[PDB]
Design a protein around this nucleic acid. Structure first.
Lengths: 196, 131, 75, 61, 50, 135, 87, 105
RNA sequence: GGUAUGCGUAGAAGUGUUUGGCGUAAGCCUGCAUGGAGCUGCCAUUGGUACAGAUCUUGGUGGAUAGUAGCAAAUAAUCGAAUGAGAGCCUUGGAGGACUGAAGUGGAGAAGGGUUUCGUGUGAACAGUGGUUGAUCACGAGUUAGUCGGUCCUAAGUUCAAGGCGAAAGCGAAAAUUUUCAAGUAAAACAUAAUUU
RNA sequence: ACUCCAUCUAAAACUAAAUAUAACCAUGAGACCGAUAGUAAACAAGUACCGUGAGGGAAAGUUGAAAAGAACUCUGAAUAG
RNA sequence: UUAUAUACAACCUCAACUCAUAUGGGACUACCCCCUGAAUUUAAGCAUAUUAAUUAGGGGAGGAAAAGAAACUAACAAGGAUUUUCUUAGUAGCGGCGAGCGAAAAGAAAACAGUUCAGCACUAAGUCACUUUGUCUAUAUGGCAAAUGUGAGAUGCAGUGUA
RNA sequence: AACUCUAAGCGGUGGAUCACUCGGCUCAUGGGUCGAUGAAGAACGCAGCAAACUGUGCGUCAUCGUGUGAACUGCAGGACACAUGAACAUCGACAUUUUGAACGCAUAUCGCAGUCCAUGCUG
RNA sequence: UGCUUGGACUACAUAUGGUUGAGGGUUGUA
């Protein structure tokens, strides 16, 4: 999920500067030609210079994407599923799970028919897992980047993951709860089941 | 969210705000009606004319007041209200401007077109409850 | 995409000549560009390590087609 | 406008309207084969059309 | 001079009215960061040539 | 044959380039005929030509043109196709019969390089660096 | 005498204002413009002059036509039809 | 220089950097091409969604004696030998293409 | 990318600092000072990832000298008055002694300049001293043609109907051939008549 | 060269789709840059200026929530204190 | 009808027209079509080679263009327009056989669409363009007729038909 | 006390830092939009107070229609004729000077005409 | 005809048509 950054390949080089070259008591970089614009002579083309081209400018054909072997995806999903039980390893992601009554927690199929989000935080109340998505309310914050200019002004932590089988109305019913996200059993993205 | 033609960019949503022209700056300068008015019309909020009586609620003035507005200075996104003033060094009272998100309309200046806004805006608050 | 701390430049920075020598500096191309010259100043490198470079053994088949020798094998 | 609308009805049912009454659209679509004239059909083309209509089937097991 | 074209007196007409200070009021517009007139030529200091 | 128009004074650079008086065009003489017509009569499209006679200092030909705005050719669904815009100046882009000669287009093996469409679009695609996303 | 002495004898223009450029570039004696070629019926731009090409290209002026034309297309090249009051 | 390594032949002497193709729109050509198949399968009919008939077996050479060149033809004897309607077969969608000179019984 | 149910207008980053320690070091924590809105510890994975140098780049600043070299060609000014906050100027006016010295430091035009022109004002800047003055600044003004010029003619030349040539663009074209390739005439019939390349 | 075999029909004409796209209209993005960086140009930027010309080519962002931009007094010839 | 003694009527070739109506010359530049065509470089020198059948090009188009319906492949149990991607393959081959270059058939997939002339026989010009008069409605570089009004057209237009 | 050296305080010079950002760079998507009916580009003019920028052509910071429904704003004036519409958007009606694509002939000439109609004075 | 002010037109190349033509080109009837 990663698209290319790359600087303009003409940045650096639309001056026309020839090295006004020795012996003029001043060093040997390409200096700008003109006279009159006060950009003269003034240093062009090099990364040491102001205006000049960066050391190796970043291209688009850097390898941004990748191929993992597809058994190694399945033997990375398998270890994630297997660790979504075992509540020592849920509880060491934070994840307030000391109200839940089972691991791995299985709810009936009827919850896929739920349709309004009020009847979802009624549901996540009753199974004692509201206290986790109340913790995702606690850590809504702001990023400390550069995110804050570049349209990531934060996440919070993650919350649960309602693995349904058939969205009767479930995915629309769990959209606006902050922290939770649902998934369907055929897909099972790993990047959900082991964030980070 | 879900629409694809809908931006979520801060680079974009401020340019397409701070350079919105002078008739879409009408919409962005909307003010909340008081809770009496939502009985009388069932409209949540309405943009302001020059002469809708208003009540500041948030700010240093903060209001309990029959304030009429004198001008909605759209290029400043601000409204000047007919008491809400401040002295110059000379003593000539000038206006302190208040953004109409943080003002409160009390009595709308009813003419024929503003009323048909409240016919437009007063059916759709019903038909968004019949869904 | 490559973990740079294990790259030498994180570590050689900064001692002065960056791993390449004071006497015998890292210059631009001090031996030839490419396979120059494997017949004069690289010949020892080219026989050993590749005996059989620089000749012609021969029978030319203009446009070999790779079906007339297909014959997969099984013991 | 009253001069220009009045010049159009005195120039109806006349070929050779004046240039500035002749539908500006572009230059590129003005030069190219009036939409009747693209669809002129040679007698081979309007005989091989009418013989075999394209039928509406479903090759399904 | 004294013997100029019509085209050269018309261009030297125009460059006589672009040679002005900023009006005293547009310093006071809201969001008007016009400090000085920036492109004020000056007869012995910059010529024209152009 | 075409004498490289070099200023009396050399095709400078390497002796490979030093040739002046045996160079031959890549275009025909028939194609060079249709050009000098169709350049000159800018509002008539060229169809073909043919040899008619020659003598020894002037090969010379006979070009067929078609006004594409006469109604008797616009009405005509057998000749109508040259009226489209995609045939403007159809031999300054090489596309008559005696223009397609000098390109080199055909099939297969013998005309392999060049099979990209035309002739220059083959070296675009032979030389193409495919920087696949999932290497 | 190649210096400030000779530079004082310069008082006759080599170039005048052009017609399709309006720039001191019309060489009078060539009767040609150094930047566009006044008697050339064609504009004089080159590919080794990427900067100069975009100093006098489509868009830098007022495109009195290639701006409204751009709008007529968004409305489908309609013409002769005028609007009506909304109902 | 140095070492026992594998004589190089990388063909990067020809101002190659201006021949680079991105492939960053691999995914939204997959999406383009799919939304067209959906578009075209609805803009036919109940008619099949691919859909010609595409004949053959017997791809040519000695490697592929068996794995198909993908059948353009149906070669008019096979139409005439099968109850149709050679011009008619095209109107169904049988793909009649009259360049193959059927060489076997 | 996850996490710390982190920190934050009850004061974030940064910056300063005889706050106090920690580390062998790179470094780091902390108090106070200023500041006024964002920031960190940890686990991953990464980068445009660490400066004393490159006659490095770009901006700033020192010594010299903060007042040193210097403001010395074109003979020269001096009085008293009026100004004015202030006058060696040019500010002016009266006396005045001198210079240029008609091949002038004079009066006008060409090219060039482009409003510098001329009145009324005037603070800074500029006028390498000053400045009340100014080719400066601010604001108002100002160029009148049948006779003066252009415009009209042709010179060297631009060479310019394509007959031609060139892949084209285009052409070191005193063309030398291009049907009338004419510049033409109130001129008759049965292509206006000797005629102009 | 000589015997056959295989395979197409030159020297005439069209034709969508898949394909291409630093330009043009109209959009959505991003492990990008954050005013010596990123376009030369975040601003009256191909501007100011320089060159006869071809061409060259800058510098230049931030008061505060709101101008409430410092009335008035004294001293000054005064900006100023 | 032609000693260059006049006229008529044709035709061919060719003129002229401020004749009636039409096209033509954009400029953009990323892609596209045709041209034309270096040298820096690399070869640790250098001259073929290499750059590169490429910068500069430089004429001509479109929303894509060009291509394109076999004077093709192949040697099989046979394939079947073009274009594009994957693979063949950095392979056969080219190369001071040096430096270096370097494709295609088959396979896999995207998308798939076919066709028109010329020319014997096809045996009543069956043909087009305007032109005016109606009619049909529209800003129809129209339709239906009409005069068969010119004209084109047997030095051949139309129908049928195509390797 | 001069002067020098060292430190911090205070004041100046100076504009780093950090924190911001209607701008860029990259990637992607929907599109096809074109001048002799004068384009692209150029010159010159246009506002109550305007230099530029933006906008624009003697109808000149506009513009018929149409949408929307009280403003513009540095001051002044008008408008508020919102019910028969402000300002902005939109734009299909009109229009679009000198040029370049002057289309009469041409130049560092606002140069010089030919034919035609009309208005005015001739008469 | 004399002047003024307004309008309309007049570039080249080309296609078809129209109109006047040209030719010891080629025939024909007088």
């Amino acid at each position: 999920n990663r698209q290319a950054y790359a600087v303009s390949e003409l940045a650096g080089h639309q001056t026309s500067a020839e090295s006004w070259g020795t012996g003029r008591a001043v060093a040997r970089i390409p200096r700008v030609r003109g006279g009159g614009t006060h950009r003269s002579g003034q240093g062009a083309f090099g990364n040491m210079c102001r205006g000049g081209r960066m050391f190796a400018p970043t291209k688009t054909f850097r390898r941004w994407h990748r191929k993992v072997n597809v058994n190694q995806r399945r033997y990375a999903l398998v270890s994630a599923i297997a660790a979504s039980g075992v509540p020592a390893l849920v509880q060491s992601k934070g994840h307030v799970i000391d109200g839940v009554s089972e691991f791995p927690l299985v709810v009936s199929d009827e919850v896929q028919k739920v349709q309004k989000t009020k009847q979802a935080v009624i549901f996540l109340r009753r199974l004692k897992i509201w206290a986790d998505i109340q913790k995702v309310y606690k850590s809504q914050r702001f990023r400390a980047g550069r995110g804050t200019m570049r349209d990531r002004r934060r996440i919070a932590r993650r919350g649960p993951l309602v693995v349904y089988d058939k969205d009767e109305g479930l995915r629309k019913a769990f959209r606006n709860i902050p922290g939770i996200e649902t998934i369907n059993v055929d897909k099972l993205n790993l990047l959900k089941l082991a964030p980070g | 969210k879900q629409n694809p033609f809908v931006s979520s960019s801060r680079r974009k949503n401020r340019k397409r705000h701070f350079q919105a022209p002078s008739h879409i700056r009408r919409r962005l300068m909307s003010a909340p009606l008081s809770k009496e008015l939502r009985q009388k019309y069932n409209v949540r909020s309405m943009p302001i004319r020059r002469d809708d009586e208003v009540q500041v609620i948030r700010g240093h003035f903060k209001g309990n007041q029959v304030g009429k507005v004198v001008q909605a200075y759209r290029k400043k996104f601000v409204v000047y209200v007919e008491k809400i003033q401040r002295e110059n060094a000379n003593g000539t009272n000038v206006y302190v401007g208040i953004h109409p998100s943080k003002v409160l309309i009390v009595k709308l200046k009813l003419d024929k077109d503003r009323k048909a806004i409240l016919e437009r805006r007063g059916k759709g608050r019903l038909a968004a409850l019949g869904k | 995409m490559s973990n740079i701390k294990r790259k030498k430049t994180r570590k050689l920075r900064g001692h002065v000549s960056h791993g390449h020598g004071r006497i015998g500096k890292h210059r631009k191309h001090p031996g030839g560009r490419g396979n120059a010259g494997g017949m004069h100043h690289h010949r020892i490198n080219f026989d050993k390590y590749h005996p059989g470079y620089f000749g012609k053994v021969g029978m030319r088949n203009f446009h070999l087609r790779r079906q007339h020798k297909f014959r997969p094998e099984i013991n | 406008q009253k001069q220009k609308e009045n010049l159009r009805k005195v120039f109806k049912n006349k070929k050779y309207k004046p240039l500035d009454l002749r539908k500006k659209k572009t230059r590129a679509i003005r030069k190219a084969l009036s939409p009747r004239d693209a669809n002129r059909k040679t007698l081979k083309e309007i005989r091989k059309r009418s013989v075999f209509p394209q039928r509406k089937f479903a090759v399904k097991a | 001079a004294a013997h100029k074209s019509f085209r050269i007196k018309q261009k030297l007409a125009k460059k006589l009215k672009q040679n002005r200070s900023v009006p005293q009021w547009v310093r006071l517009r809201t969001g008007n960061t016009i400090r000085y007139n920036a492109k004020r030529r000056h007869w012995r200091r910059t010529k024209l040539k152009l | 044959g075409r004498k490289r128009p070099v200023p009396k004074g050399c095709t400078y650079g390497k002796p490979k380039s030093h040739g002046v008086n045996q160079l031959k065009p890549y275009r025909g003489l028939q194609s060079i005929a249709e050009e000098r017509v169709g350049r000159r009569l800018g509002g008539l499209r060229v169809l073909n030509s043919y040899w008619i006679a020659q003598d020894a200092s002037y090969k010379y030909f006979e070009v067929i043109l078609i006004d594409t705005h006469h109604s008797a050719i616009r009405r005509d669904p057998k000749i109508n196709w040259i009226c489209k815009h995609v045939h403007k100046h159809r031999e300054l882009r090489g596309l008559t019969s005696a223009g397609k000669s000098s390109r080199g287009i055909g099939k297969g093996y013998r005309y392999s390089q060049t099979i990209g469409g035309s002739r220059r679009a083959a070296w675009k695609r032979k030389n193409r660096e495919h920087m696949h996303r999932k290497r | 005498t190649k210096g400030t002495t000779s530079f004082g004898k310069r008082h006759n223009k080599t170039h005048t204002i052009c017609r399709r450029c309006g720039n001191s570039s019309y060489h009078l004696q060539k009767s040609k413009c150094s930047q566009c070629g006044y008697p050339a019926a064609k504009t004089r731009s080159f590919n080794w002059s990427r900067k100069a090409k975009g100093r006098k290209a489509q868009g830098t002026g007022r495109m009195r036509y290639l701006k409204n034309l751009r709008r007529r297309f968004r409305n489908g090249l309609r013409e002769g039809g005028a609007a009506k009051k909304k109902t | 220089g140095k070492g026992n390594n594998m004589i190089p032949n990388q063909h990067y002497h020809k101002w190659w950097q201006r021949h680079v193709k991105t492939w960053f729109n691999q995914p939204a050509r997959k999406v383009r091409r799919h939304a067209n198949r959906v578009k075209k399968a609805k803009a036919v009919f109940p008619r099949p969604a691919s859909g010609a008939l595409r004949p053959v077996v017997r791809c040519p050479t000695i490697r592929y004696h068996t794995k198909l060149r993908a059948g353009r033809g149906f070669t008019l004897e096979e139409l005439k030998g099968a109850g149709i309607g050679a011009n008619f077969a095209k109107t169904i969608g049988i793909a009649v293409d009259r360049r193959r000179k059927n060489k076997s019984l």
